[PDB]
Design an enzyme around this catalytic site. Structure first.
Site, mmCIF file in Angstrom:
data_model
loop_
_atom_site.group_PDB
_atom_site.id
_atom_site.type_symbol
_atom_site.label_atom_id
_atom_site.label_comp_id
_atom_site.label_asym_id
_atom_site.label_seq_id
_atom_site.Cartn_x
_atom_site.Cartn_y
_atom_site.Cartn_z
ATOM 1 N N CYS A 134 0.975 -1.044 0.070
ATOM 2 C CA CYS A 134 -0.001 -0.100 -0.124
ATOM 3 C C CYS A 134 0.591 0.924 -0.061
ATOM 4 C CB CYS A 134 -0.901 0.423 1.477
ATOM 5 S SG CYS A 134 -0.246 0.343 2.836
ATOM 6 N N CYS A 170 4.225 1.108 3.762
ATOM 7 C CA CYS A 170 6.030 1.398 4.609
ATOM 8 C C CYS A 170 7.003 1.697 3.095
ATOM 9 C CB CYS A 170 6.148 -0.004 4.092
ATOM 10 S SG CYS A 170 5.898 -1.747 4.599
ATOM 11 N N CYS A 176 2.206 -2.490 10.547
ATOM 12 C CA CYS A 176 1.540 -2.720 9.503
ATOM 13 C C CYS A 176 0.616 -1.258 9.993
ATOM 14 C CB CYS A 176 0.426 -3.361 9.511
ATOM 15 S SG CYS A 176 -0.573 -3.154 7.503
ATOM 16 N N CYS A 223 3.495 -2.083 29.771
ATOM 17 C CA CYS A 223 2.065 -1.159 29.780
ATOM 18 C C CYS A 223 2.020 -0.353 30.756
ATOM 19 C CB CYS A 223 0.904 -2.254 29.185
ATOM 20 S SG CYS A 223 -0.344 -0.786 28.591
ATOM 21 N N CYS A 245 -7.414 0.137 31.630
ATOM 22 C CA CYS A 245 -6.938 -0.820 30.419
ATOM 23 C C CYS A 245 -7.717 -0.966 29.538
ATOM 24 C CB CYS A 245 -6.744 -2.413 31.061
ATOM 25 S SG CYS A 245 -6.218 -4.312 30.248
ATOM 26 N N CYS A 278 -7.928 -4.309 22.871
ATOM 27 C CA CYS A 278 -6.387 -4.523 23.006
ATOM 28 C C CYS A 278 -5.311 -5.979 22.734
ATOM 29 C CB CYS A 278 -6.167 -3.680 24.589
ATOM 30 S SG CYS A 278 -3.764 -3.437 24.130
ATOM 31 N N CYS A 282 6.808 -0.146 21.323
ATOM 32 C CA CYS A 282 5.729 0.338 21.067
ATOM 33 C C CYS A 282 5.118 1.556 22.455
ATOM 34 C CB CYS A 282 4.194 0.457 20.136
ATOM 35 S SG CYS A 282 4.646 -0.638 18.434
ATOM 36 N N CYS A 317 -0.713 3.550 20.003
ATOM 37 C CA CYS A 317 -1.610 2.991 19.456
ATOM 38 C C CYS A 317 -2.575 2.731 20.601
ATOM 39 C CB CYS A 317 -1.882 1.374 19.051
ATOM 40 S SG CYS A 317 -1.060 1.870 17.190
ATOM 41 N N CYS A 324 -3.818 -1.723 20.653
ATOM 42 C CA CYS A 324 -2.595 -2.330 19.900
ATOM 43 C C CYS A 324 -3.878 -3.357 19.607
ATOM 44 C CB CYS A 324 -1.998 -3.526 20.741
ATOM 45 S SG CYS A 324 -0.854 -3.805 19.682
HETATM 46 S S1 SF4 Z 1 -4.341 -4.899 27.392
HETATM 47 FE FE1 SF4 Z 1 -3.381 -3.591 26.350
HETATM 48 S S2 SF4 Z 1 -3.837 -1.457 27.497
HETATM 49 FE FE2 SF4 Z 1 -4.079 -3.188 29.049
HETATM 50 S S3 SF4 Z 1 -2.739 -3.716 30.139
HETATM 51 FE FE3 SF4 Z 1 -2.424 -5.175 28.083
HETATM 52 S S4 SF4 Z 1 -1.269 -3.693 26.245
HETATM 53 FE FE4 SF4 Z 1 -1.806 -2.275 28.369
HETATM 54 S S1 SF4 Z 2 1.095 -0.784 19.402
HETATM 55 FE FE1 SF4 Z 2 0.647 -2.700 18.411
HETATM 56 S S2 SF4 Z 2 -0.982 -2.430 16.378
HETATM 57 FE FE2 SF4 Z 2 0.538 -0.168 17.387
HETATM 58 S S3 SF4 Z 2 2.395 -0.308 16.241
HETATM 59 FE FE3 SF4 Z 2 2.477 -0.499 18.294
HETATM 60 S S4 SF4 Z 2 2.267 -3.282 17.485
HETATM 61 FE FE4 SF4 Z 2 1.419 -2.552 15.973
#
Ligand code: SF4
Ligand code: SF4
Ligand code: FCO
Ligand SMILES: [Cl-]
Ligand SMILES: [Fe+2]
Ligand code: NI
Ligand SMILES: [S]
Lengths: 483, 283
Positions: free
Chosen positions: B18, B21, B159, B211, B232, B238, B247, B259, B265
């Site tokens: 697409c 990248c 992606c 996280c 959460c 997620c 990330c 994200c 995510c």
């Molecule tokens: S489910 Fe998602 S928001 Fe919740 S603690 Fe895990 S990575 Fe973080």
């Molecule tokens: S947080 Fe999850 S969806 Fe967002 S870029 Fe990272 S791996 Fe991809």
């Protein structure tokens, strides 16, 4: 004085995606053209059977240059299908996410895709090698300004994606638009961050980009005299300015055969005689659309379907929207039209049909539209309310349909979804570069770019630079066109 | 780097991509994309940004490829469709002969120093290979293996991927090659790939275990609307628990968001993306 030469260009470069152009040249002019979109993925079949909410992620992967447009069309279609009532603040937040990518996309297109048509880059790849006679007319000083601005624009377009990501999560491929609105309420602190970036983009657009397009254009005045094609345009409306669904920054309309006409989406049909799809699927409106690939079908030459509006072959994009809507020209544009062209103009149509619907006119329209979008974004930054909720959480319906209409940076975009048993039953996409870069329809009428190639000069068959220059003026992305 | 330094040749071939990248790479902050192009690599073929066009562009790539046989880097963006004799992705034409993505990978793949499969489509098949597709969309490593092509592959998925994952993997490989030569250097790169071919500096840590909302997850405090940023995001869909990417630390687009903060995510770096990560908006 000369006969025929047939020229094939594959890949056409400095566009998005996979395109072949084949032109017939006779006596120094293009007399026939065929455009072939050579890559297919089939999003309309991939989507079937999924939770409808997944569409607003999946569809963005049609195209990483304009993913916010597909996100927007998808969430609008889902909003309608689900009966989701987007909160006012979420409507504005969506506009801030999407509007920032208009700025990114137009700047990317002019500098990083188009400008090498007129500017010689540094003596290293990917700027060399190129055609020995590339018809690069700029003085040493103005060429250097083009290179310096290309380099600066790399930073400016990146800043535009920071603007997208502030409320959109990341870019390419936003997380922040869903059925029901936008996933993150703007905070006062992040609105400061968006505005500080926006000021830098505004200064670049006003001081560098709009002036350079007119200035380069003034060295290529011949390029306003070619590329007219059908002189026919479509706009489906975009950027809702209130919650009525009736008022938009770009209002819908059709222009063809010298006449303004209303837009009625029931008059869209997609033909496939010259496209690699099963013959039984020809002539369908998108609400009944079908996507059945037929890569071996005789006579076909593209994976792009052939959309027609009441039988008409139309173009889309900044020129289309600016012609249909006829806004005032930017202060810069008015001044440079006078100083460099001897033209007295106040509104966009004062350029006249012939110069507007031209190779260079399409670059001018895109620069003018970028300036116009600055005022829209500034307005949304005054209208948004920090802290006010931006989303509702609607239940998935068992049975429903919806259509989302918007304007991607390259032109009109719609997504249609039909839900059955709480899953996607059909999903049909009619995108911008589909309208521009399509093949002939079942009656043999050419697509918009195919027709705009007619008359393009090729005075040197060994350096046929104006063929792809014309194509690039339309800012094609074949990922969008085929999906 | 310098404008006058050593810069290896790179060809960037797009299959069923697409262009996301390429666009994500344009967003690199440190080093900037200008510095990458002018000081780090020599991007000899890339259809989105290069000056020349058509057969001339193809022939230029072929001339560089002959001069640098065994030594150029081949980036693949997008999957490789094998159905219908390759006809679902035509990338060029030369000598009145169409060149499919299948043809191109069979031509250049054997002669690259290494193939960098950039993005989840190229690495694992991605959306073009997902349920409902019919093009035979194939991941780079599988296509090369099926055709007896032994050239080393490094997967840089996402992606899109983060620019730092793409540029950083290039920097890692070029450093290893500077220290050890080509074969010794690529051997050092392979040593730091996980079982899915991903460099462990970027993909060696789980999102969820790092996280900032992990305490809310463990307490069962779940957001019921996307705009509640305290809870959460698990009930909203997620996929952090099943996703290996950094990330949570580098974030996206100059650090302005990511994200999980913004929404959820979707597991975009994982080999089963999208089908094994769907539906996106429920657990
Ligand atoms: S489910 Fe998602 S928001 Fe919740 S603690 Fe895990 S990575 Fe973080
Ligand atoms: S947080 Fe999850 S969806 Fe967002 S870029 Fe990272 S791996 Fe991809
Ligand atoms: N802009 C953009 Fe993409 C295209 N063409 C869409 O719709
Ligand atoms: Cl967009
Ligand atoms: Fe379609
Ligand atoms: Ni696009
Ligand atoms: S695009």
């Amino acid at each position: 004085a000369t006969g025929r030469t047939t020229i094939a260009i594959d890949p056409v470069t400095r566009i998005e995606g996979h395109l072949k152009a084949e032109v017939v040249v006779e006596n120094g002019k293009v007399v026939d053209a065929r455009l072939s979109g050579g890559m297919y993925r089939g999003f309309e079949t991939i989507l079937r059977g999924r939770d409808p909410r997944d569409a607003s992620q999946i569809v963005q992967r049609i195209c990483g240059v304009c993913p916010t447009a597909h996100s927007t069309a998808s969430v609008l279609a889902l909003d309608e299908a689900f009966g989701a009532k987007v909160p006012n603040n979420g409507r504005i937040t969506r506009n801030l996410i999407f509007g920032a990518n208009y700025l990114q996309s137009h700047i990317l297109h002019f500098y990083h895709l188009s400008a090498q048509d007129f500017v010689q880059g540094p003596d290293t790849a990917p700027f060399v090698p190129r055609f020995p006679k590339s018809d690069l007319r700029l003085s040493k000083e103005l060429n250097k300004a083009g290179v310096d601005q290309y380099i600066e624009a790399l930073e400016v377009r990146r800043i535009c994606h920071e603007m997208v990501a502030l409320f959109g999560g990341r870019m390419p491929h936003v997380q922040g638009q869903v059925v029901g609105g936008a996933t993150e309420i703007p905070t006062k602190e992040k609105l400061v961050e968006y505005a500080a970036r926006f000021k830098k983009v505004r200064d670049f657009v006003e001081q560098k980009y709009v002036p350079v397009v007119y200035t380069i254009g003034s060295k290529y005045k011949d390029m306003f005299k070619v590329g007219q094609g059908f002189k026919a345009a479509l706009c489906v409306g975009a950027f809702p300015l209130d919650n009525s669904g009736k008022k938009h920054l770009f209002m819908p309309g059709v222009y063809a055969k010298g006449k303004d006409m209303p837009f009625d989406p029931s008059k869209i049909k997609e033909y496939v005689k010259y496209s690699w799809f099963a013959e039984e699927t020809t002539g369908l409106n998108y609400k009944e659309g079908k996507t059945i690939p037929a890569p071996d079908k005789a006579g076909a030459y593209s994976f792009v379907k052939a959309p027609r509006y009441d039988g008409l072959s139309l173009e889309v994009g900044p020129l289309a929207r600016m012609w249909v809507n006829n806004p005032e020209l930017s202060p810069v544009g008015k001044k440079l039209l006078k100083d460099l062209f001897g033209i007295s103009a106040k509104k966009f149509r004062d350029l006249g049909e012939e110069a507007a619907f031209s190779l260079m006119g399409r670059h001018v329209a895109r620069a003018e539209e970028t300036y116009y979008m600055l005022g829209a974004i500034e307005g949304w930054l005054k209208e948004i309310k920090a802290g006010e909720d931006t989303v509702v959480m609607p239940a998935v319906p068992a049975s429903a349909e919806g259509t989302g209409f918007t304007e991607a940076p390259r032109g009109s975009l719609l997504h249609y979804v039909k839900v059955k048993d709480s899953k996607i039953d059909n999903y049909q996409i009619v995108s911008a570069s589909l309208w521009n870069c399509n093949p002939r329809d079942d009656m043999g009428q050419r697509g918009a770019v195919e027709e705009a190639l007619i008359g393009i000069p090729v005075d040197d068959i060994q350096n046929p630079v104006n063929v792809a220059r014309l194509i690039r003026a339309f800012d094609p992305x074949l990922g969008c066109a085929v999906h | 780097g310098t404008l006058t330094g050593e810069r290896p040749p790179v060809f960037w071939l797009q299959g069923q991509g697409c262009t996301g990248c390429s666009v994500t790479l344009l967003n690199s902050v440190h080093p900037s994309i200008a510095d990458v192009l002018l000081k780090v690599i020599s991007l000899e073929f890339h259809p989105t940004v290069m000056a020349w066009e058509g057969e001339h562009a193809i022939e230029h790539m072929r001339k560089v490829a002959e001069k640098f046989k065994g030594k150029f880097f081949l980036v693949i963006e997008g999957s490789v469709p094998v159905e219908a004799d390759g006809k679902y992705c035509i990338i060029g034409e030369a000598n009145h002969h169409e060149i499919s993505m299948v043809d191109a990978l069979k031509e250049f793949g054997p002669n690259a120093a290494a193939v960098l499969a950039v993005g989840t489509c190229a690495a694992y098949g991605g959306i073009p290979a997902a349920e409902g597709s019919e093009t035979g969309a194939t991941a780079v490593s599988k296509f090369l293996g099926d055709n007896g092509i032994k050239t080393p592959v490094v997967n840089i998925p996402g992606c899109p991927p983060h620019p730092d994952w793409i540029v950083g993997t290039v920097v890692l490989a070029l450093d290893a090659i500077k220290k050890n030569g080509l074969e010794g250097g690529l051997a050092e790169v392979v040593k730091v790939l996980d079982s899915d071919g991903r460099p462990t500096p970027f993909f060696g840590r789980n999102i969820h275990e790092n996280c900032p909302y992990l305490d809310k997850y463990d307490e069962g405090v779940m957001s019921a609307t996307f705009t509640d940023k305290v809870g959460c995001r698990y009930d909203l869909g997620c996929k952090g628990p099943m996703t290996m990417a950094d990330c949570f630390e580098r974030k996206w687009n100059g650090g302005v968001n990511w994200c999980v903060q913004n929404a959820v995510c979707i597991g975009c770096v994982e080999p089963d993306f999208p089908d094994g990560k769907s539906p996106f908006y429920q657990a």
